[PDB]
Design a protein around this ligand. Structure first.
Ligand SMILES: *Cc1c(COP(=O)(O)O)cnc(C)c1O
Ligand SMILES: *Cc1c(COP(=O)(O)O)cnc(C)c1O
Lengths: 405, 405
């Protein structure tokens, strides 16, 4: 940086602390990643200066010839990546992408069927403290109490009983592949739209490592960050039949001016995801997750669903008589970043939990492989088995430091 | 830029076109500005990598010690600038800031009183194609048909008749000072909350050149871009009594993860606005607007309200028998960027209009002064009086080129 350090010492000092933190810590929060310098440069561009309400070639303000090229690059590359008939790259966030789809197809009070939030569903899939559960009538389907896999018969029974106008599939804490064909079959049976929120798994979908929801869903929402490794923001994919409505829901429905610099960054990240090396990256993410899962089981830990099909795993800490909160706190002391997470049928509150959620996307981006996964598992074992031993925690701290160099 | 040009030639080429466009054109769109290199550097930072749901010292994820410092810098500086009891710097946009306030105090179907959209009100103040008019029952107050000043007796009569739960003041196309004391008096009479959306005038408010809504309003919403000259995004200011509710409305109510890099950029822009030279800048904005207004009147143009108290003016093109659409198009041909804008009681549709809206914030940022205002007025006169003369338009083009160098 050249201008920020002189203009704003306080902000610069805090940014520099954050940069050093990102390097020093082991980032295992499953939604986290590190974007490329190219992506950041696009976000740091003069495109922040442009008001571009509307869409490419159909803007409400003049002077948009070049931002149109950028937005179209983002839309076309997204269509290449995911095979969707239409893309909308303007959502400010995953939350706003979801908001717009709900705005498109639902009226206030309509019934919507989503994944149980305590079983892996997202806040925007019907939390009573979120606009989703306040604005619409959410009902929930669950995972099996033993296998922790979505119970598709439960999805079906809930859909037939409650007659939702919309069914939502996808999750922020579900470690197995989701069967979109089955969701669509159930949707079809009850005459419901199907929305898939692929935010967590979008990079995996792009790399052909998770089945693609696009062919099965009327609407697919996503973040551009997370496994897709782009800037923070949202995107909607859909069939051409809903394109006009989706575009209108975003603007003038729920947003104003788009963030053209972030859209530039989205185009860049989509460019990166189209490359062969991104596919290799994503395979290493899933390989690392599988390895870390097996290594954790070797250390004596129980995993929700007994492992993982994707980038993420959930540790059921009940056998160790620990809460997620305790584990998260002690791991923080040694430089490992996880989050407490409810496990299915958790006897604890969402503020305490019986679990921790772990993902490999971030550590894979920094070049960690199988050997590093074994060592991360060994460190986690050392820490969680010796929570009252400062000797053990210092050893962990040193081993964490060895990994991040 | 160092990495973007190699990684993504297509995106880089389009960005470079946009950068050159920003320099070559005369930007008169009243909401536009140019941010500092420091602001852009903050937006281009590694803070995009951080998930920070929640608030400083009350986050739902670990590792937020440094982004907390950044967000608190933004909140404290905003409180210094505007004298508010509480700031929320997380809204992704002006639209989301408004969305959150509505979410805080209103139920679906509640009556809200806002400025007539054709008289200067914003899309988010009750457009039937926007979430505001779909979700709530909007009624409108108007400006006087002659003076084009808000009719405060109309505000009062509408409030007494319709009994709104919320009254909204502020505008995207209103060239005079808004009397917040009078709005609050009317709000008090009918037991309505008062919300002021100061997006357009926020930089002027910060510089003491427009009366501050904070002392009079329960809630103040704003963009951080526009006259405030920050990155694109939103902010909510409010009394401490509503702080908890406002924070909860933003998250977990309407958004997910905040954009911490944009929040850094917000802190930077607030730092800049606190400086003496920003105050001098803002005075030049208003001085330039007054000068440009008078110079346009000298060229024979009629202005809505007969002039301006702020950064913006509206030309009533009816005396020249032109639509806003025609004027906007021809000005675009010579390198002057305006927008068509409805004038109060416009006989034309919002897609055609009888007006153009013009603001001086952007040209002032690039160092234009009174002499430049006279010349911009002279060029606009030359063009709009000779729409069928290619000779005249080429002369205009050359004079525009002389100004931008
Ligand atoms: C992260 C996430 C979101 C929300 O994205 P934000 O950008 O944080 O609003 C929505 N759905 C799922 C499944 C997510 O993981
Ligand atoms: C620009 C504006 C908004 C919306 O801000 P976005 O960031 O474009 O959503 C809201 N209110 C007023 C008065 C505005 O001028």
């Amino acid at each position: 940086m050249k201008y920020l350090p002189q203009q704003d010492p306080q902000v610069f000092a805090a940014i520099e602390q954050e940069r050093k933190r990102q390097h020093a810590k082991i980032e295992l929060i499953a939604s986290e990643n590190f974007v490329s310098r190219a992506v950041m440069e696009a976000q740091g561009s003069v495109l922040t200066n442009k008001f571009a309400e509307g869409y490419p070639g159909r803007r409400y303000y003049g002077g948009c010839e070049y931002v149109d090229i950028v937005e179209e690059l983002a839309r076309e590359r997204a269509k290449q990546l995911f095979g969707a008939e239409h893309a909308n790259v303007q959502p400010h966030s995953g939350a706003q992408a979801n908001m717009a789809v709900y705005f498109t197809v639902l009226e206030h009070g309509d019934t919507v069927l989503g994944m149980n939030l305590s079983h892996g569903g997202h806040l925007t899939h019907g939390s009573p403290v979120n606009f989703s559960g306040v604005q619409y009538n959410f009902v929930a389907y669950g995972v099996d109490p033993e296998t922790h896999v979505i119970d598709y018969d439960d999805v079906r029974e809930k859909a037939r009983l409650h007659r939702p106008k919309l069914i939502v599939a996808a999750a922020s804490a579900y470690p197995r592949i989701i069967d979109f064909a089955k969701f669509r079959e159930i949707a079809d049976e009850v005459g419901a739209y199907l929305m898939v929120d692929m935010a967590h798994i979008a990079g995996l979908v792009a790399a052909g490592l998770h089945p693609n929801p696009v062919p099965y869903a009327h609407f697919v929402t996503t973040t551009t960050h997370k496994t897709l490794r782009g800037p923070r923001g949202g995107m909607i994919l859909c069939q051409e039949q809903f394109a006009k409505q989706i575009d209108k829901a975003i603007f003038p429905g729920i947003q104003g001016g788009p963030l053209m610099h972030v859209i530039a960054a989205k185009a860049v990240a989509f460019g990166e995801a189209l490359q062969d090396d991104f596919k290799a990256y994503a395979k290493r993410v899933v390989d690392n997750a599988k390895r870390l899962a097996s290594a954790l089981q070797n250390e004596g830990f129980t995993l929700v669903s007994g492992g993982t099909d994707n980038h993420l795993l959930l540790v059921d800490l009940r056998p160790q008589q620990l809460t997620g909160k305790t584990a998260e706190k002690v791991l923080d002391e040694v430089g490992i970043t996880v989050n407490k997470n409810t496990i299915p049928y958790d006897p604890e509150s969402p503020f305490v939990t019986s679990g921790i959620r772990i993902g490999t996307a971030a550590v894979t981006t920094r070049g960690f492989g199988l050997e590093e996964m074994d060592e991360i598992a060994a460190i986690i074992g050392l820490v969680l088995k010796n929570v009252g031993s400062e000797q053990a925690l210092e050893e962990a701290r040193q081993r964490v430091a060895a990994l991040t160099d």
